Ligand binder design. Sequence first.
Ligand SMILES: O=C(O)c1cc(=O)[nH]c(=O)n1[C@@H]1O[C@H](COP(=O)(O)O)[C@@H](O)[C@H]1O
Ligand SMILES: O=C(O)c1cc(=O)[nH]c(=O)n1[C@@H]1O[C@H](COP(=O)(O)O)[C@@H](O)[C@H]1O
Lengths: 256, 256
Amino acid sequence: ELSFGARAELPRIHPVASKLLRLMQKKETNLCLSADVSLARELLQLADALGPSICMLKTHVDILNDFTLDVMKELITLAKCHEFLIFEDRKFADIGNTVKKQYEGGIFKIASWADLVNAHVVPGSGVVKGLQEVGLPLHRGCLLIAEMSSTGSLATGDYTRAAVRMAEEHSEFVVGFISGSRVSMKPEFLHLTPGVQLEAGGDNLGQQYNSPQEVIGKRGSDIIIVGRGIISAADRLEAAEMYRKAAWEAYLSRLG
Amino acid sequence: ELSFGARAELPRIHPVASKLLRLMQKKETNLCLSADVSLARELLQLADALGPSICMLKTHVDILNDFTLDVMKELITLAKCHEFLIFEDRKFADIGNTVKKQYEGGIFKIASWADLVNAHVVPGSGVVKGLQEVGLPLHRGCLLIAEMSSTGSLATGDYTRAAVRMAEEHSEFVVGFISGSRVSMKPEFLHLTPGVQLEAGGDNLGQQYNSPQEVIGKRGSDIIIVGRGIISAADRLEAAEMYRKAAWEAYLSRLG
Ligand SMILES: O=C(O)c1cc(=O)[nH]c(=O)n1[C@@H]1O[C@H](COP(=O)(O)O)[C@@H](O)[C@H]1O
Ligand SMILES: O=C(O)c1cc(=O)[nH]c(=O)n1[C@@H]1O[C@H](COP(=O)(O)O)[C@@H](O)[C@H]1O
C-alpha cells in the first residue's frame, strides 16, 4: 500500500486526484467537511476556520438560500488559501444530454467552480460521457457513487461492480468513488466515505453511521465525509480536528 | 382497463393523479412536453402555445439561465389557464435528510411551484420519506424512476421491482413512475415514458427512442415525455399535435 504522497505520483493518476493526494499528505488530513448549511456567511466562516483541517469541502449548492456565483468566488479564495478541493455533491443521475447542461449551465454553473462532482451509475455510462464533455476541457474530475450509506441502498453486488468498471473505463475524468469501503483495487482511484460519526447511531431518515477507524482502517477507504458530526457541534473547529486525527491515524495504521 | 376519467375516481387515487387524469380525458392529451430550453422567454412561449396540447410540462429548472421564482409564477399562470401540471424532473437521489432541503429550499424552492417531482430509488426508501415530509403538507406528488431510457441503464429486474414496492408502500405521496412500460398492475399509479420520438434513433450520449404507439399501445404506459422531437422541430405546435394524436390514439386502441 502506497502513501497518499506516493499515490499522487502514480503514472495513471488524474491531475485533480494528484493535487488532492499531495495536499492530504502535506496537511495530514483525509477529512472532507460536508458543509450542509443554508447561509453563505456560515459556509464561508466554516471554510475559513476549518480550511487548515480539511482536504476537501463538499457543497450542496442547491440548499444555499443566498447562492450567488460571488459566494463561490469567495469559497475558491479560501480553497486556494487553505489548500482544499471543492466537491459539489450534485449526484448527477440523468441522461448524458441533460447532465451536460446541468453541469455547465443554469444559475449554478457548477463546472466553473467545482474541482469535483459526482454521479450515479444507474443511467449507464452516458451520464459520465455527458459530464466529461464539459469537465475534461475544464480540467475537472468526477466520483462515481458505488455504495451509499442509507438504509435500503440498492448500490450493492453487481451494481457496485458496474460502478467500478465504469470508473476504470473513464479514467480520463473519473478519479474515484463515493463508497463505504475500498471497491477498486487500483490505487489511482480515491475512495470517499460518508455516513461517518465517532458515536454509533443514525438519523430519522435512513442515514447510518460508522466510525473513522471502521471505514478508513477496517474498510480501507481514503477520505471521510462528515456533516452533522461537525456542523451540529458547538466548536466546529475542535470537532473537525477530532475527525481529522481519527481518519489520519486510521490511515497511518493501515500503512504500517 | 379503465379510461383516464374512471382512473381519476379510483378510491385510492392521489389528488394530484386525479387532477392530471381528469384534464387528460377532458383535453384528449397524454403528452408531457419536456421543455428542455435555457431561456425563460422560450419556456413561457412554449408553455402558452403548447399548453392546450399537453397534460404536463416537465422542467429542468437547473438548466434555465435566467431562472427566477417570478418565471415560475408566470409558468403557474399558464398551467392554470391551459390546464396542465408542472413536473420538475430533478431526480432526487440523496439521503432523506439532504433531499428534504433540496426540495423545499435553496434558490429554486421546487416544492413551492412543482405539482410533481421524481426520485431515484437507489438510496432506499429514505429518499421518499425525506421528500414526503415537505411534499405531503404542500399537497404534492412524486414519481419513482423504475426504468430509464438510456443505454446501459441498471434499472432492470430486481431494481424495477424494488421501485414498484417502494411506490406502493408510499401511496400517500408516490403517484406513479418514470418507466418504459407498465410496471405496476395497480391502476391508481401513472406510468410516464421518456425516450420517445416518431422516428427510430437515438442521440450521441446514450438516449434511445421508441414510438408513442410502441410505449403507449404495446408497452402499456400512460403518458409520453417528448423533448427534442418537439423542441428541435421548426413548428413546435404542429409537432406537439402529432405526438398528442399518436399517444391518444395508442391509448384509445388499448382500451378497445
Ligand atoms: O455523496 C455523498 O456525499 C453522500 C452519499 C451517501 O451515500 N451518503 C451521504 O450521506 N452523502 C452525503 O454526505 C453528507 C452526510 O452528512 P451527515 O449525515 O450530516 O454526516 C450529506 O450531505 C449527504 O448528502
Ligand atoms: O425523468 C425523465 O424525464 C427522464 C428519464 C429517462 O429515463 N430518460 C429521459 O430521457 N428523461 C428526460 O426526458 C427528456 C428526454 O428528452 P428528449 O430525448 O429530448 O426527448 C430529458 O429531459 C431527460 O432528462
